[PDB]
């Protein structure tokens, strides 16, 4: 069996797996009030991609396909292709096209289009609301709100690049996005299918450890916290190595590379998430000046040193 | 001594190291007419970063810092911080802040900003012309043209997210952007310093192999071809592995995973670029349905099988 290992990039050098932005810190705290069931950034330690997880760090929350204008509006329907411009088959055993956003919110970006007959191009500000009834990526159908009613052509390659998130209206601040609320991938009133399982700490005295970024804000007072279970580089590495899991739990160590100091301990679970010995109702934030180091296989009953 | 190896992800699954977009194909042809000296995606096989190359795949052509409004216009000057929000040190032996664009052109994107008191956010269309006289990233200053003259606060975290290239100089002309023309990093009428060296084929009967993407176009008729010398995932891998080079040339083989067939042979050079045995005046484009496999170190005298 090939020896298991973990990338030696520092957290500061790695990418969020749920939005194309760099990681900024670590986060642990109580998640009892939420169902922690993200679909992107899900991968087993022996290399099985789950949920809607694909391998490109920039193909996250991106959309590709062709667009159809909705008359009397500045809204466009995108008939979806897969992230590599293959036909999207709605019968594949996945919740949605790979890389589909896994949280409810209004994601702002740009719609770009190239006409293949002469290489003419255009770009427009666009917003997609993954909570709207017409958000149905599992059916191959997504609606975008743009600033034009005419400039986009049918049957031409179109790409959505995400930039950030917005909050609107006179409602409470940071009410939106809701990073732990999965969208209805098939539209209003449908059940999601083939989901990566929800995760929660099991051994008592432990809590989940999150790899956290801050989504750029484009308008309003949004909740820009975005926690992921594995860095996108870890997803790429486990898939490549596919090292057999000698046990259910890999013991990792957080090491500052300049001092060599060990700063805390944690458990990497075979199904692809991390728990630490952190307790209580407050949150603990950890600067990103460290890398993870695999030291030995253990079981779920190993007792971690509180961090 | 650690054995050398290259990631096993197919080209389709890897990211361009000169812009945050996926790789789409391989490209080889005569390039003696150009000076091939990109500063991003520059890394030796034992993991020494060169030029302005950093490790994040999403922090390429991004800028971070605070902005000062240029009165009487919709333009802003961004006083730069490093990509990790540290004070930029212009006395570092680098050509420009790590991740700076390494080509002359008009790059379109969005400027987002967060006010640290109340968490209010804002985003605006923005273009940076890397050929402009006030494009002086090495001095810590870059200028953006936006769509506002008021809605940006001073001394607040501001980020530029790139989306694509535009084109409004020679209109239908495919004369811009110019991917093999370095900016004047210190501004108009200055000379660049600490460049990663230019590359060219040395062995008779050989040409450079490029990892090619197509940049999104946002306006006009831009030249969207973008060739990098190494996938950003290879830069990441070499930096972590840091395996000693037993020879100046690693022999790789391009293999289609679905079949196991070798499609061609190539030399990976210690300094961080690839050459193949190909010598027409015609270009050759290769679909990205294959990965690279390190087979053995060889000398510069090795004769590759033609393609």
């Amino acid at each position: 069996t090939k020896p298991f290992s973990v990338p030696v990039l520092t957290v500061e050098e790695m990418t969020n797996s749920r939005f194309p932005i760099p990681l900024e810190k670590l986060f642990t705290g109580p998640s009892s009030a939420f169902v922690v069931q993200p679909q992107n950034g899900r991968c087993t330690t022996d290399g099985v991609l789950l949920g809607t997880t694909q391998l490109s760090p920039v193909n996250i929350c991106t959309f590709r396909g062709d667009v159809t204008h909705i008359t009397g509006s500045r809204n466009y329907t995108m008939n979806l292709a897969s992230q590599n411009w293959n036909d999207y088959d709605p019968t594949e055993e996945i919740p949605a096209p790979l890389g589909t956003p896994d949280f409810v919110g209004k994601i702002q970006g740009v719609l770009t289009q190239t006409t293949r007959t002469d290489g003419s191009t255009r770009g427009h500000k666009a917003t997609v609301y993954t909570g709207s009834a017409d958000f149905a990526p599992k059916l191959g159908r997504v609606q975008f709100e743009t600033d034009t009613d005419r400039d986009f052509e049918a049957n031409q390659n179109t790409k959505f690049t995400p930039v950030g998130v917005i909050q609107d209206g006179g409602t409470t601040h940071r009410n939106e996005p809701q990073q732990w609320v999965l969208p209805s991938y098939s539209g209003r009133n449908t059940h999601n299918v083939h989901l990566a399982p929800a995760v929660a700490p099991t051994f008592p005295g432990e809590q989940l450890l999150f790899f956290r970024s801050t989504m750029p804000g484009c308008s309003g007072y949004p909740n820009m916290d975005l926690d992921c279970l594995l860095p996108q580089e870890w997803v790429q590495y486990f898939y490549q190595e596919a090292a057999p899991a000698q046990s259910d739990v890999a013991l990792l160590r957080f090491v500052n590379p300049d001092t060599g100091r060990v700063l805390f301990e944690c458990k990497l679970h075979k199904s692809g998430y991390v728990t630490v010995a952190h307790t209580g109702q407050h949150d603990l934030v950890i600067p990103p000046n460290g890398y993870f180091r695999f030291d030995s296989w253990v079981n779920q009953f190993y007792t971690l040193a509180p961090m | 001594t650690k054995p050398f190896s290259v990631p096993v992800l197919t080209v389709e699954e890897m990211t361009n190291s000169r812009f945050p977009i996926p790789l789409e194909k391989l490209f080889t042809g005569p390039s003696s007419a150009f000076v091939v000296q990109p500063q991003n995606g520059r890394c030796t096989t034992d993991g020494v970063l060169l030029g302005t190359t950093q490790l994040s795949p999403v922090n390429i052509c991004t800028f971070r810092g605070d902005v000062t409004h240029i009165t009487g216009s919709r333009n802003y000057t961004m006083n730069l911080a490093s990509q990790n929000w540290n004070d930029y040190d212009p006395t570092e032996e680098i050509p420009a802040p790590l991740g700076t664009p390494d080509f002359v052109g008009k790059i379109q994107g969005v400027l987002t900003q967060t006010t640290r008191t109340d968490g209010s956010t804002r985003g605006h269309k923005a273009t940076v012309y890397t050929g402009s006289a006030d494009f002086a990233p090495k001095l810590g200053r870059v200028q953006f043209e936006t769509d506002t003259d008021r809605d940006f606060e001073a001394n607040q975290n501001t980020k530029f997210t790139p989306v694509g290239v535009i084109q409004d100089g020679g209109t239908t002309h495919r004369n811009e952007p110019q991917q093999w023309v370095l900016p004047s990093y210190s501004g108009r009428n200055t000379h660049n310093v600490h460049l990663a060296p230019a590359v060219a084929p040395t062995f008779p009967g050989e040409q450079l192999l490029f990892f090619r993407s197509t940049m999104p176009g946002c306006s006009g008729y831009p030249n969207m071809d973008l060739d990098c010398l190494l996938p950003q995932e290879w830069v990441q891998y070499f930096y972590q592995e840091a395996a000693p080079a037993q020879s100046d040339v690693a022999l790789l083989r391009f293999v289609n995973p679905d079949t196991g067939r070798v499609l061609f042979e190539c030399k990976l050079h210690k300094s961080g670029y690839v050459t193949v045995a190909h010598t027409g005046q015609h270009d050759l484009v290769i679909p990205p349905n294959g990965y690279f496999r390190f087979d053995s170190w060889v000398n510069q005298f090795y004769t590759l099988a033609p393609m």
Partner: nanobody, 129 residues
Framework: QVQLQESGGGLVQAGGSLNLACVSS????????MGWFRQAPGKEREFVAS????????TYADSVKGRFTISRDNAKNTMYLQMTGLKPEDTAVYYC??????????????????????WGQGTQVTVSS
């Protein structure tokens, strides 16, 4: 989960010296960037000094450079501020603060108050002309 307690400092004549200390307690993490701030009645809180967890990078306000010295002892969970040449201008409450998001002593926003996430109740320094 975090309490910063600063001590030392009281009444000193113009020209004198003081030694402030700040002790960390609770669910803390050793890499947090930390600094000193001061606020006088009816005025705005202003930056004084900062230092990283490795004592690599020290930063001082222009109005205290040369006179003040920031120092950090992680094993004792204590930050220090040695003050000399005290003028009545330096009369204020002195607070120690800590930014859980950052570790670099060159973090470009290290002088902004709103970047720090944990604050002590402060110790009073009064310099008498």
């Amino acid at each position: 989960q975090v309490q910063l307690q600063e001590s030392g400092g009281g009444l000193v004549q113009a020209g004198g010296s003081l030694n402030l200390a700040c002790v960390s307690s609770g669910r803390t993490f050793s890499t947090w960037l930390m600094g000193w701030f001061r606020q006088a009645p009816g005025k705005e809180r202003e930056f004084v000094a900062s230092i990283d967890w490795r004592s690599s990078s020290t930063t001082y306000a222009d109005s205290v450079k040369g006179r003040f010295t920031i120092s950090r002892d992680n094993a004792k969970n204590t930050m220090y501020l040695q003050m000399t040449g005290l003028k009545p201008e330096d009369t204020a409450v002195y607070y120690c603060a800590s930014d859980r998001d950052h570790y670099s002593g060159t973090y470009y926003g290290r002088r902004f108050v709103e970047e720090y996430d944990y604050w002590g109740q402060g110790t009073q320094v009064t310099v008498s002309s």
